[PDB]
Amino acid sequence: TNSEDKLSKVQLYEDLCRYEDTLSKLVESVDRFKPNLDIAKDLIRTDEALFENVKLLAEDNIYRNLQKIDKDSEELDSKTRKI
């Protein structure tokens, strides 16, 4: 149950959320064959924000290195424990 709470905590989740909302507005506009510029510009800037957050996620690897050094920590602890 806490998983979804953690997922909602990171910004890019909200980013995909309002990106979906903006495309929903755009499709509603084109359904009414009345394309509103503000919806499209909101869509493009939200997409750009998505893409910058896509870069920001990548520099990931730090957590992975922390994970391997954590495994090193507990394996050293177990070794010294059996010692």
Partner: protein
């Protein structure tokens, strides 16, 4: 109003997301302007995209291995082959091609689209008026008109990878600063507007229409003021130029109280305590960005530029110095008087304006 709104939305979408520089996006852009386009394989490593219209042919060489544009060539089907599509840089032996630069130096197609829209305008509206010839020669006629009128302005073609006739002044550091850009624009207001060829005659020292039979319809010669940008905006007396010649009036839309900073400076008591400011303007100040200088209005270029230069050197500096926290300072449309100490007017030389500002700064500091 639906078509005008749709065209305005299409222009907005074209400007807001110009697309990435790819062969497919360049082809789609050319097709969106009604240009005929074909792709040829010159080699296993090189493809050419050739695009054509009535007069213009543009070859774009694409390196398939590098994912990059290698070359761009413009060819005219006019009897005039001398159209300058290179940037005018003083002291570089390599004339840098505007079209190639717009596809290699920029992150997007916006620079290329603007330059292509300009070439397409000349193509569509050239017939017996050849606008490629006339626009090239016009830069020489304006340069001569300034020499004959003793105007200290430099004329350059094609500045910063953009088509246009650029009018430059010497700035305080001897650096050239653009004052205005002259170019052709579609006349949205009157498709029947006759645009004639005007030549500057060395003999008469005037603009002359040699061939009243040589006209194009639905085009205007536009003078755009290049703001270095609210304090860097140029303001004109409302009666300085006929309202029919004003293409773009910056309407301060009715929800932000930006008077000219000049008029707010007649209303706001936050002055240098040494100066009593007196307003002697008879007219309202309006912000004008674009002028129609077509036909008989080519004489106005020198008057508009003198005002723009006087406004930058005198008015804007007087305002900057008065606005930084008793002598009477009278400010009018064409003259400024500091009590009995110093005066300058719009018809004085630039050297008189500089001396007035130096003396004014020494008193206000």
């Amino acid at each position: 109003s639906y078509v005008e709104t749709l065209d305005s939305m299409i222009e907005l979408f074209k400007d807001y997301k110009p697309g990435s520089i790819t062969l497919e996006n360049i082809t789609r852009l050319c097709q969106t302007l009604g240009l005929e386009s074909f792709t040829e394989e010159l080699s296993n490593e090189l493809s050419r995209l050739s695009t054509a219209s009535k007069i213009i042919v543009i070859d774009v060489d694409y390196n398939k291995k590098q994912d990059r544009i290698q070359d761009v060539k413009l060819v005219l089907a006019s009897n005039f082959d001398n159209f300058d599509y290179f940037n005018q840089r003083d002291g570089e032996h390599e004339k840098s091609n505007i079209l190639l630069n717009s596809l290699t130096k920029y992150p997007d197609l916006k620079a290329f689209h603007n330059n292509l829209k300009f070439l397409y305008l000349l193509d569509a509206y050239s017939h017996k008026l050849d606008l490629f010839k006339y626009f090239t020669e016009l830069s020489h006629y304006i340069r001569q008109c300034f020499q004959d009128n003793c105007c200290d302005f430099k004329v350059r073609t094609n500045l910063n990878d953009k088509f246009g006739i650029y009018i430059l002044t010497q700035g305080i550091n001897g650096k050239e600063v653009p004052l205005a850009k002259i170019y052709l624009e579609e006349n949205k207001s009157d498709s029947q507007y006759r645009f004639y060829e005007y030549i500057y005659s060395q003999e008469t020292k005037s603009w002359i229409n040699e061939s009243a039979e040589n006209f194009s319809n639905g085009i205007s010669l536009v003078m755009e003021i290049v703001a270095n940008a609210y304090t860097d905006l140029i303001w004109f007396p409302e009666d300085f130029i006929s309202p029919e010649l004003i293409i773009d009036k910056v309407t301060c839309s009715s929800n932000s109280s930006s008077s000219p900073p000049i008029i707010d400076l007649f209303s706001n008591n936050n002055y240098n305590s040494r100066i009593q400011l007196m307003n002697d303007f008879t007219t309202k100040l309006i912000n004008i960005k674009k002028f129609d200088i077509s036909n008989d209005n080519l004489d106005l270029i020198s008057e508009i530029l003198k005002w723009v230069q006087w406004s930058r050197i005198v008015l804007q500096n007087v305002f900057k110095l008065v606005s930084t926290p008793v002598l009477q300072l009278i400010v009018s449309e064409d003259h400024i008087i500091l009590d009995t100490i110093s005066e300058c007017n719009l018809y004085d030389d630039v050297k008189c304006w500089s001396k007035f500002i130096e003396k004014f700064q020494d008193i206000v500091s």
